[PDB]
Symmetry: C5
């Protein structure tokens, strides 16, 4: 049974934790409100791993369909104001 | 098994798929779409926040290909930001 | 086997026929000769069209959609732009 | 068996042929030394598989395409260099 | 058993080798840091045979790429062939 999953990161709310046997991570997208500075999203333990770098006037968003993450997973907006959205599916 | 497609816009920013599995392939801006960024969401089914699946803009990225996304119906797409047209393609399986 | 086609304002359509009961669609690419306007490629019904790609020379000259499998007959149409636009795939 | 595979195309070497199995093709990338013109890469029996340009799209990923050898790539337009990467399987 | 993997390449560390029944490095994304300057970056894999180029990125053009589905057999040596970075690689160690 797969359920749709999503989150929004920003400078005000820089972190989000998924914490169902696997998180299927599909896309990462900038919101229309996001400033122009490069954005960077990392996954934190339990060093950080950078999974995406995006910029409004250069690369709207990115697809990474196929990535499957083992929970718990913490995302952090390591650089930029956001909003930055993430989409995916929980599967078990 | 069956090809699927839908165009979202200011006139129609919402669409819902019902019949097993929507394979979602690409999302593309139309040549008549104006400059502004466009954002496409999937709404949660009624039973917390819409899930953003694509951000596109004509001068910087006019489409994206997310082959491998497989959605269970009903699925409601919404054109959250932008006037469109924005197209969606995929297959009903 | 390997399969490809070129669409243009002169030749706007290109129908695939004959295993070869599956067309794997891999990439869609603008030619270096395509002019600056946005290009849109749709797939047409046998007997509403579905847009599968939007491209523009100065913004995004190609796209990969490896994984799409289509059931023949498939008719592609260059709905907008003058081309050339190329498609590639693998008859399966 | 799997072995990493790569080749480089350019005006000085327009084509490259892989043969003695499937070639898993991964990415196609412009070199930093490349010029600014649009580059187009074909597979010759031609089928165009990529268009790239340094100031617009310097590479593309094609993880999933599997080719039956022999396979000949051609730099149909542009001066290069253009790199291809993949994996020989079996 | 799968574990998240991530490395950072730069002028400082312009080469990293992932060393070892079985294990595959699943290679997911390669992304420029916001601190990378304007030059083109190119990342190779060096034979444990010439180097193989796997990505070309540039901040003002294409700051990252996804290559989900690439499964590398160790040993795998990554090299930042052109560019000062930082450039980040992400993936998972499987099995």
């Amino acid at each position: 049974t797969t359920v749709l999953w999503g989150c929004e990161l920003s400078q005000e709310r820089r972190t989000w934790t998924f914490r169902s046997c696997r998180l299927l991570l599909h896309t990462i997208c900038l919101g229309e409100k996001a400033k122009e500075e490069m954005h960077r999203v990392e996954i934190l333990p339990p060093q950080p791993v950078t999974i995406a770098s995006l910029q409004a006037s250069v690369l709207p968003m990115v697809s990474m369909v196929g990535v499957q993450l083992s929970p718990p997973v913490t995302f952090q907006l390591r650089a930029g104001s956001g909003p930055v959205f993430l989409s995916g599916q929980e599967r078990y």
